[PDB]
Amino acid sequence: KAIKAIAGYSISKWEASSDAITAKATNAMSITLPHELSSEKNKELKVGRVLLWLGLLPSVAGRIKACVAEKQAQAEAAFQVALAVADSSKEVVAAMYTDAFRGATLGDLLNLQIYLYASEAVPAKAVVVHLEVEHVRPTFDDFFTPVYK
Amino acid sequence: GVQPVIVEPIAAGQGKAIKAIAGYSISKWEASSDAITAKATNAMSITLPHELSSEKNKELKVGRVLLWLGLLPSVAGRIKACVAEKQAQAEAAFQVALAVADSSKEVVAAMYTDAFRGATLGDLLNLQIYLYASEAVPAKAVVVHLEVEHVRPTFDDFFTPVYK
Amino acid sequence: GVQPVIVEPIAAGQGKAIKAIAGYSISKWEASSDAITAKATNAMSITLPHELSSEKNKELKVGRVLLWLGLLPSVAGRIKACVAEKQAQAEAAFQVALAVADSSKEVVAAMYTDAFRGATLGDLLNLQIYLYASEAVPAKAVVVHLEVEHVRPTFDDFFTPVY
Amino acid sequence: GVQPVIVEPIAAGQGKAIKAIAGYSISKWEASSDAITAKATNAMSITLPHELSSEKNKELKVGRVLLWLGLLPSVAGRIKACVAEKQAQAEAAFQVALAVADSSKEVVAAMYTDAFRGATLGDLLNLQIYLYASEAVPAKAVVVHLEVEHVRPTFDDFFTPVYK
Amino acid sequence: GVQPVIVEPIAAGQGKAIKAIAGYSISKWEASSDAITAKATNAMSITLPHELSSEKNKELKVGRVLLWLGLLPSVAGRIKACVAEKQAQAEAAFQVALAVADSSKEVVAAMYTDAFRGATLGDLLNLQIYLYASEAVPAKAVVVHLEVEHVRPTFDDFFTPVY
Amino acid sequence: KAIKAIAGYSISKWEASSDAITAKATNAMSITLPHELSSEKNKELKVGRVLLWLGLLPSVAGRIKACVAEKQAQAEAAFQVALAVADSSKEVVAAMYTDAFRGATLGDLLNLQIYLYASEAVPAKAVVVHLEVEHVRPTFDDFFTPVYK
Secondary structure, X not given: OOOOOOOOEEEEXXXXXXXXXXXXXXXXXXXXXXXXXXXXXXXXXXXXXXXXXXXXXXXXXXXXXXXXXXXXXXXXXXOOOOOOOEEOOOOOOEEEEOOOOOOOEXXXXXXXXXXXXXXXXXXXXXXXXXXXXXXXOOOOOOOOOOOOO | OOEEEOOOOOOOOOOOOOEOOOOEEEEEEEEOOOOEOOOEEEEEEOOOOOOOOOOXXXXXXEEEEEEEEEEOOOOOOOEEXXXXXXXXXXXXXXXXXXXXXXXXXXXXXXXXXXXXXXXXXXXXXXXXXXXXXXXXXXXXXXXXXXXXXXXXXXXXXXXXXXXX | OOOOEEEOOOOOOOOOOOOOOOOEEEEEEEEEOOOEOOOEEEXXXXXXXXXXXXXXXOOOEEXXXXXXXXXXXXOOOOEEEEEEEOOOOOHHHHHOOOOOEEOOOOOOEEEEOOXXXXXEHHHHHHEEEEEEEOOXXXXXXXXXXXXXXEEOOOOOXXXXXXX | OOEEEOOOOOOOOOOOOOEOOOOEXXXXXXXXXXXXXXXXXXXXEOOOOOOOOOOOHHHOEEEEXXXXXXXXXXXXXXXXXXXXXXXXXXXXXXXXXXXXXXXXOOOOEEEEOOOOOOOEHHHHHHEXXXXXXXXXXXXXXXXXXXXXXXXXXXXXXXXXXXOO | OOOOEEEOOOOOOOOXXXXXXXXXXXXXXXXXXXXXXXXXXXXXXXOOOHHHOXXXXXXXXXXXXXXXXXXXOOOOOOEEEXXXXXXXXXXXXXXXXXXXXXXXXXXXXEEEOOOOOOOEHHHHHHEEEEEEEOOOEOOXXXXXXXXXXXXXXXXXXEOOOOO | OOOEOOOOEEEEEEEEEOOOEOOOEEEEEEOOOOHHHOOOOHHHOEEEEEEEEEEEXXXXXXXXXXXXXXXXXXXXXXXXXXXXXXXXXXXXXXXXXXXXXXXXXXXXXXXXXXXXXXXXXEOOOOEEEEEEEEEEOOOXXXXXXXXXX
């Protein structure tokens, strides 16, 4: 089976491709909401659980780590405080945050960042980061936009 | 069975007024404009009053929003306006707006019944006002009026305690 | 389902007349205009009729105010009128008015349901009438009619004592 | 029979707040001061807010009035203040005042429970504020806060009718 | 008629402790001061403790805020403190504060019952603490204690998963 | 999901950074309570379960082990008697002590030590040790300090 969202909650999924990475280097990528949730009305919706997993090219060599944390002056120091890390050298390359954000809002996610690490040279678009975020269902999504505008 | 009716003419300012829902109050303020070039657009920021600019008061939920613009009796041209999110392109806000106030209609106003419902008063600072003109217009020639329904502030019926 | 409906055309002078609220009466007077420059505006102070200008009656409350203007039939163009507070700019009063009377529409009128509901007849001397015209207009071409409802005066059905 | 009691100490700003009577609301605003000479007095006019300066709103009855003054933490001297009618002599207003706020007390405030009851908001413009200083003080060194209980304005829960 | 009454003297530490309202908890932390020029004022930003600095907890509502300061016993003079919004003038915050803590009185404290009732813990980062002294005071001589009551956090009695 | 504390119990979390480590060397670090639990009144509170996990820098090479045990004359000999070890060469880098301390007090934890091991040179602050301790909730934590002091 799989994990089902609680009553009154929906799950939104999107992805973001990566840039080039150097050796023993760590990039910081900001989080961008999908356009359908970018309004001020929808930035007030609560957040439940958040799941991170990534997909590498089959020819990518070396160990790739990733996590989501708050903004840090030193990019590498994020991994010491993150509550879960997606490491490509174990059975499950995923990072589940079941309680790290439960109660924040979608507008709060713009204050977070995604940190990627690589021990070997990585070209552009080699890694794809998948983000899945559970949140309160939008209040009006079963109505047409009124015609008289 | 048919039914005959008579339609009664209505004078200006004679219709019914909208009433706020329980637990809410309506605050009003207006802002001036500056010069607009022919076939151009302007972006105008939204600034709160002083009495609603404390951390306590910027946590009040928003209801409905009304935007109506008053202009000089001698301005020639077509004026349009809307309220939307901040955009790189000022003219591109009209392509996605849910209500546009156009001066060449019978009612020059726009009602946003659901676009900003559930936001907070402090979130309103992230919205802008876009203003278009068909022909060149000078400054102060058009005034925009903004009316926001929001939760009634909790403590406005109490004197300040005397022991400071 | 669908209901058929017949709309009956009406002539001028057909239509309801608004009735004053209980305990109130309506007083009417008019003001004549002077020459107006094209694309300019005029301001003129409200003058109470001689029968309401005493201290006894300037303390009565105000309900609704109605404005309507009657033009010379030869006059053509566009005339606009409004009632507001005294303004530094004559034409700026149209940006803050809650109603404007226009001659290019079918009903040339302006109704103020709550703009002054609760003031006194003496407060009307603090207001002004603003008149705009797109073309030049000679004097005595626009007559401004005002209708005000107010609390019914209490001691007026008496003769003046002469003993 | 005797009765023993314990008196509990109270911290600053810990007492009860006064609540307005039915049908009334409280509006607040503050005004700055200018330089005061040693052993001298100043007369400060009273100006209404903008939202309460229409003919409709200057007909609202007044209830209670509270005057409390906040001053810099570094001002040396004694400061007194009162609200009274306009007078030829500024120092002579303290001889007839019903409540004087003196900075050398535990509670620095004055309550006027009956002096101005039954007047109107437009009548308040006829009153002044008198301010005394024992030693020389600079400008902006003392701010006066004024709180007026008055009848709740009738139409603040309604949207403006759209047909202008 | 007249009732006799005996007043019982109390020692320091005797007196009631205010209980937090249902559904709320109280978190306490302290801040140390630095050198203060005589007849001058200092401003210092509120820093949340590390256990409330996450996005999850900065969305909790605020009830009451209590301030009290503890001095070195050798320190003499007058110290004043208040919590307000950020001000262009450091000392102007005392003219708009709803309470001030003074060391020349018996209780050196300041209670804010409604000044911030309804804000968020993240809004406290928009406020500042202002400290004034009549004489010169060296660093680490005033310790500012803050006590804040807020909505009780919901998901904190769990271990961090490690699967 | 995650593991919830029993009735009448709360969980306190803190961390301590590491010093430099030599090759095939083992350091001993004493445990320090948070300041809010350091009083004699709060040192009498009972202890439930204790969890240890650590966060390395992504560029740290070599195998890092860690455990908490009693004071030992020989530092390395702790790993032979510890009931759980956090090894950075397996799926879960964590050490759970579900019954090793259940019944002791917080004052007893000052008699324990944390032992770290490294097979390669490690600079200062490279490892961060996270400690999570379940204990009886303090008896007075919903009251203000009385004003008249």
